[PDB]
């Protein structure tokens, strides 16, 4: 139990603790289920050491675990100047993509008093 899923429900479906975690969602969860060739319907296969933990290499070509944000957390510091539209909108909590502020902005502005 918990050989890849980090949560205590160990008798349930192959999405539980195996999606939206450390750079893995449905599409990349399928890609390591495919790497080990195992079964997924109703429950994930009961498995031992040296069977799928050895195959994390077959899904490694993405930002994962300790590397999920590491280098972008330095690259995103590159623009900070107040005259730069991207610099200012990194230096303050603002959308670099641009949005409307007058009407239907209440998620970004948060709750009103």
């Amino acid at each position: 139990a918990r050989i890849a899923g980090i949560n205590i429900p160990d008798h349930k479906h192959a999405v539980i603790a195996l999606t939206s975690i450390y750079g893995v969602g449905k599409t990349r969860s399928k890609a390591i289920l495919a790497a080990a060739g195992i079964a997924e319907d109703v429950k994930i296969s009961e498995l031992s050491e040296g069977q799928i933990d050895t195959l994390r290499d077959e899904v490694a070509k993405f930002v994962v675990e300790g590397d999920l944000r590491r280098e972008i957390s330095m690259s995103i510091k590159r623009l900070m100047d107040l005259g730069c539209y991207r610099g200012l909108r990194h230096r303050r909590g603002l959308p670099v993509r641009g949005q409307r502020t007058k009407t239907n902005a209440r998620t970004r502005k948060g709750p009103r008093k």
């Binding site: 139990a1 050989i3 980090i6 050491e49 933990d53 300790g66 590491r70």
Partner: protein, 178 residues
């Protein structure tokens, strides 16, 4: 204690030889190692924290104690008999029984190295560390409804320069700055 013969080669022996020393006493040694856990948490009802000390007693060479405070200045309205920690330190014989698996061979889930090495060292084992982020590995009675418990380590060495004593760390699962 069944594992201590490695001390003649795997640690401090190349250091000993690159000064032409003849004794393990001319190079650093471990005075004491401490495995201390925190009890000062104030976010839930204090209900499962002695079984969290039993989870530490599954790897410590001495079982945790009740403990007492020394100050009563705190905003927690405590008496100086208030339990303040766990009191877990190893000297000599059962410290050779700790490195028998822990921080030496216990985890096969090694990481692709990006740079994270031992830090802030100065001249007396001046590096302190807790564990970061979850991967899960087998532990005793761990099918329990409680958050994942680790260990927070402190160590004291007979050193004067920890940068010179860097070979005392060579048998461990963690790296040192080049």
């Amino acid at each position: 204690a069944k594992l201590h013969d490695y001390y003649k080669d795997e640690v401090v022996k190349k250091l000993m030889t690159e000064f032409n020393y003849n004794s393990v006493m001319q190079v650093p040694r471990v005075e004491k190692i401490t495995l201390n856990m925190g009890v000062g948490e104030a976010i839930a009802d204090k209900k499962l924290l002695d079984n969290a000390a039993a989870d530490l007693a599954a790897i410590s060479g001495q079982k945790p104690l009740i403990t007492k405070a020394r100050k009563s200045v705190a905003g927690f309205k405590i008496r100086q008999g208030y339990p303040i920690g766990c009191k877990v330190t190893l000297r000599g014989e059962r410290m050779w029984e700790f490195f028998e698996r822990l921080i030496t061979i216990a985890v096969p889930r090694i990481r692709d190295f990006r740079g994270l090495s031992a830090k802030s060292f100065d001249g007396r084992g001046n590096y302190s560390m807790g564990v970061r982020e979850q991967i899960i590995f087998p532990e005793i009675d761990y099918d329990k409804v409680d958050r994942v418990r680790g260990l927070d380590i402190t160590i004291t060495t007979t050193a004067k320069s920890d940068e010179e004593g860097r070979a005392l760390l060579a048998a461990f699962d963690f790296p040192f700055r080049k």
